[PDB]
From Swiss-Prot, chain A:
It is linked to Cerebellar atrophy, visual impairment, and psychomotor retardation: An autosomal recessive, neurodegenerative disorder characterized by developmental delay, intellectual disability, hypotonia, scoliosis, cerebellar atrophy, and variable dysmorphic features. Changing residue 123 to T: Found in patients with retinitis pigmentosa; uncertain significance. This is ER membrane protein complex subunit 1. The chain holds residues 22 to 149 of 993 of the full protein. Belongs to the EMC1 family. Part of the endoplasmic reticulum membrane protein complex (EMC) that enables the energy-independent insertion into endoplasmic reticulum membranes of newly synthesized membrane proteins. Preferentially accommodates proteins with transmembrane domains that are weakly hydrophobic or contain destabilizing features such as charged and aromatic residues. Involved in the cotranslational insertion of multi-pass membrane proteins in which stop-transfer membrane-anchor sequences become ER membrane spanning helices. It comes from the Eukaryota. Component of the ER membrane protein complex (EMC). It is found in: Endoplasmic reticulum membrane.
Curated annotation (Swiss-Prot), chain C:
The keyword Transmembrane helix applies. Keywords: Endoplasmic reticulum, Membrane, Signal, Transmembrane, Transmembrane helix. Component of the ER membrane protein complex (EMC). Part of the endoplasmic reticulum membrane protein complex (EMC) that enables the energy-independent insertion into endoplasmic reticulum membranes of newly synthesized membrane proteins. Preferentially accommodates proteins with transmembrane domains that are weakly hydrophobic or contain destabilizing features such as charged and aromatic residues. Involved in the cotranslational insertion of multi-pass membrane proteins in which stop-transfer membrane-anchor sequences become ER membrane spanning helices. The chain crosses the membrane at residues 118-138. The chain holds residues 43 to 181 of 242 of the full protein. This is Endoplasmic reticulum membrane protein complex subunit 7. It comes from the Eukaryota. Its main location: endoplasmic reticulum.
Amino acid sequence: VYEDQVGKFDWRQQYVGKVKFASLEFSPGSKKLVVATEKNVIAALNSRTGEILWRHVDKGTAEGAVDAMLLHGQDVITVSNGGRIMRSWETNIGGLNWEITLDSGSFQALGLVGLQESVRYIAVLKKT
Amino acid sequence: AMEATITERGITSRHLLIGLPSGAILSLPKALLDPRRPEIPTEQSREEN
Amino acid sequence: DRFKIEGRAVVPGVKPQDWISAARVLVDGEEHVGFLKTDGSFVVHDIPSGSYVVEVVSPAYRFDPVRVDITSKGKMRARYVNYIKTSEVVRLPYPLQMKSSGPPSYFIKRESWGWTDFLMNPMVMMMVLPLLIFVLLPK
């Protein structure tokens, strides 16, 4: 019976948290709009329509908070928690490009370092 | 999360709604989780309900 | 002392990148959460010693949870999920390879009554004799 009445008298509205680190890059810019909120959820809105394409929720008790968020041409990099686990996501699709573990430090700043031509490395400076 | 369905008069059944980490909400009857559950199948027990 | 668990999930068909969208894996359920790669693999770090159940959560094709035992020395033993029994049932290799059976049934089925099957009614059969008798009259 449930298949017959799909959406007769039911509805779901999807929301996300307060916008903390949102970027407005993507020179092609079809509809992509990335937003990383303060509730350990990273979402992707649409400039044209406004719906959610892909969103991810890890944590929310006390850990997994987003600290910094950098953006390359097609790949987005972000650091969770406080400098222990770092994962890089994509914008054309939704998923994980690569992951990296860090040491036991205090995340203060990160940046991009280009050797001669373009960015090849990311630099992460901790307390010591 | 856990909750119970509450009706105005209270003639229907009492279903318990339970949430899961996945997101699906499952409703189970209270009759299954009844304290009057005999260990060994008893004649009158199996006869009544 | 902290360890890491990695695994690979293969869908029978479709596209791995199709199924990666909105796909996560749980180790306890709200404590440790892992995310999948572009094709498919769950890699989880920052874990203590103990026993945990790995389950891939998806509104789409579902997966069977697998019990994993972590030792302090560094031995990893995976078993079938057993609640009534608490012994070793079947031992399989460590590189988690979950095989989703398919879409779980979310809606129930309701069937109608067949034309050849409704002729078995106590009332429908008591009309067929008058129907035949009245048909044989003009013929």
